[PDB]
Design a protein around this ligand. Structure first.
Ligand SMILES: Nc1ncnc2c1ncn2[C@@H]1O[C@H](COP(=O)(O)OP(=O)(O)NP(=O)(O)O)[C@@H](O)[C@H]1O
Length: 288
């Protein structure tokens, strides 16, 4: 079969597969560029246009995206540099975790599947944080960046796009509800950004509520909601009021408590007190 990992596409090859980048092939504009669906060389792909100058530092950051290899990361099939930057990722037929949890049309995710998806996502971020030196950071961990396949397994998407945008152009970076206090207010960058954002994802798996809760014009975070649920006389009853109503009562209360306790540690104000992604993996494995 194929031994090479990435393929350098050509501009003419990408334009033909997307009808010269027509609006029909355009599947997304989630930020930092637009996304196009494409069928490239016997595979369903997703072309992500990014407007960046092709500097050597930009290419060095592009090598990090083409060299990473993990089952819990969405595969970067190829890239294209002629003109602007085009990133070709593998296509996951089922949507992201946010569409499963906060959306209707798909059957409710079983609790065991949520423990599996959380563990799958944690292993993907652990690989990012520990595979090389200096430490690399995803910088935009959120439910929409966790893709689910037909087997209900997790894959982290859009890794390194933040760094590529910043080095190519050297809210700015991040999603509301997923930013730690030291980054949202002061821009302090560290791997604890992803740990904090992951804790919110655990909160979403428990509650199926958005990171920013939907009186009006005043936002309230899901992190604050768990603070009010677990720091009360009966922490178990406060947590039971928060669990996804779609799950009904089909969940181990102790296992959901342990995941909520894990999200608490991830969402601490002091980033030094947050656990590493490695500790989160070993902690999630005791629930699976
Ligand atoms: N590799 C992929 N396979 C399948 N669907 C994808 C893939 N990448 C993106 N999508 C879908 O396309 C949409 C476009 O958004 P995406 O490009 O993922 O950015 P986002 O999640 O909206 N936020 P940002 O990372 O800030 O741009 C997503 O919401 C996914 O549903």
């Amino acid at each position: 079969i194929m031994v090479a990992k990435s393929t350098e596409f050509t501009y003419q090859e990408l334009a033909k597969a997307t009808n010269n980048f027509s609006l029909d092939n355009k599947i997304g504009q989630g930020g930092f560029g637009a996304v196009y669906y494409a069928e490239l060389r016997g595979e369903k792909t997703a072309i992500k246009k990014m407007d960046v100058q092709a500097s050597s530092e930009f290419l060095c950051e592009l090598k990090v995206l083409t060299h990473v290899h993990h089952l819990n990361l969405v595969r970067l099939i190829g890239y294209c540099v002629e003109g602007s930057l085009f990133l070709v990722y593998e296509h996951i037929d089922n949507g992201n975790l946010g569409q499963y949890l906060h959306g209707i049309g798909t059957e409710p995710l079983p609790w065991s599947s949520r423990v599996q998806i959380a563990l799958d996502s944690a292993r993907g971020l652990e690989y990012i944080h520990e595979h090389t030196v200096p430490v690399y950071i995803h910088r935009d961990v959120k439910s929409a960046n966790i893709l689910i396949d037909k087997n209900l397994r997790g894959k982290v998407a859009n890794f390194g796009l933040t760094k590529l945008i910043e080095v190519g152009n050297s809210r700015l970076v991040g999603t509301f509800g997923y930013m730690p206090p030291e980054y949202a207010q002061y821009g302090d960058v560290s791997p604890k950004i992803d740990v904090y954002a992951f804790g919110v994802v655990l909160y979403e798996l428990i509650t199926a509520k958005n990171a920013v809760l939907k009186s009006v014009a005043e936002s309230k975070g899901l992190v604050q909601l768990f603070e009010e649920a677990l720091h009360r006389m009966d922490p178990l009853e406060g947590l039971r009021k928060l669990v996804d109503p779609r799950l009904k009562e089909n969940y181990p209360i102790d296992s959901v408590l342990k995941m909520a306790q894990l999200g608490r540690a991830c969402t601490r104000d002091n980033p030094l007190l947050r656990p590493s992604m490695r500790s989160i993996v070993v902690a999630l494995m005791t629930l699976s």
